Structures are given as structure tokens and as C-alpha cells.
Amino acid sequence: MNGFERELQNNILGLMPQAILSSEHGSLNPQQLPETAVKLDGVNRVAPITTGDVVLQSARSVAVGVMLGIDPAQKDPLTPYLVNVKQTDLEPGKYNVILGEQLASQLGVNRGDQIRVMVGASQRLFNVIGTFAANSEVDGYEMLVNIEDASRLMRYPAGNITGWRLWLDEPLKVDSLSQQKLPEGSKWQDWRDRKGELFQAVRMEKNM
């Protein structure tokens, strides 16, 4: 089923980081490995990101999220799905957050509320300013924050980021693409880290 493949690509992989070029050791310093030095095969776009799993606590519930720390001035695949909120309200040092609609619902929060956002011992209160609604599973776990705020929560050195998010011409070929020559001291990680079972299903449907 190219049906299965098309759906996987458009409805899930289109709305999450397909791959990230990060540092071998710690966070990435974009002055040491700048965006212009990211020249990879099969990659059609590069953007900065700070990201990781976060534990979330509202007044009513708890959840695991995927924090997407973004430059609010760049269009994200989720930007067209924002509900009545401007991405540019994610100003650095405001600690605002835009939650997936379903994540927000499960936490029982509305805009104007705060939520506690935790990465191990590092914790910060973020201010819910809105939601996105893509009618995708990402609605249940992704959240958008300002990249600098996310880097602070992650305890990165000032100006550092997780790495360079990549968009791929053919995201189903991440196994081959991950073997290519990378900048020194960098490494490749991709969407298989989170959706491994769907990757295995793609392989299963092919071989039949």
C-alpha cells in the first residue's frame, strides 16, 4: 500500500521532526556548526530546533509531551493548524506554549492557565496561549514553544540548540539516508525513534 505510505508521510511524518542533525556530545552550538554547513543528500530544508520529551502537570492532570522549540518567525508544518493564536506570541523569555488540542483537553487546560513543564530536575511554568488542531495524533502530544525558552529548560549553554531539524524528500528512506557523510562531531537521528512500529509496518507491506 502506497496508501499506507502516503498516509504515514502526510498525516504523521509531515507534522513531526523527520530527522535531526545534532551534536555527538551535548547540545549543538550553531556558531560551531552553522546552518550553512548542513549540506546533506535527500534534505530539502533545515531549521533550528530544541526538542525533547517533557513531563507536563496542570491543575487537573499529567502527560508526556514532545516539546518543539522553534524560531516563532519561521513557518512550521503546524503553523496552518493554529487555532486563533499567532505563532509570534511565542516570544523569547515569555514562556508561552501552544498545545496540541487533545493534549490540552486531557490536561483540562485553557488559554490563560499555566502548566508545569519538566525535563528531569529542570522545571518551569509555561503559559498556555492556544492550541493547534491538525486532526493528527500529534494533537495529543506535540507542543510549540519558543526555541530559546526550550533551550533554557533543557539547561543548554546560552545560544545552543538541540540541532538542525531536517525535512526529507523521501522520509521513508531514512535508513539509507542516515548512512551518508555528516559534518564532523554531528549525528543523525530520525522519526524511527518514535514511530518504529509504523516503519516496521511499511517494511512488512512492501515485502508482501
- 183 — phi, psi (to 5°)? -55, 145
Work out how many domains the chain is built from and give that number. Answer: 1
Find the radius of gyration of the CA atoms of the chain: 17
**Calpha distance 152→23 (Å, rounded):** 17
Q: Which residue has the cell 506535540?
A: 142
Q: Which amino acid is at 53?
A: D
Burial class (CB in 10 A: 0-12, 13-18, 19+), 90: buried
**Calpha distance 23→160 (Å, rounded):** 10
* Cβ-based neighbour number of residue 84 at 10 Å: 7
Please give the C-alpha separations between residue 120 and each of 12, 56, 60, 153, 155, in angstroms, as whole numbers: 27, 11, 21, 10, 11
Inter-axis angle of helices 2-11 and 192-207, to 10 degrees? 170
Helix (H) or strand (E) holding 83: strand 82-83
**Calpha distance 21→112 (Å, rounded):** 35
Resolution in A: 2.0
Domain span at residue 190 reads 1-208
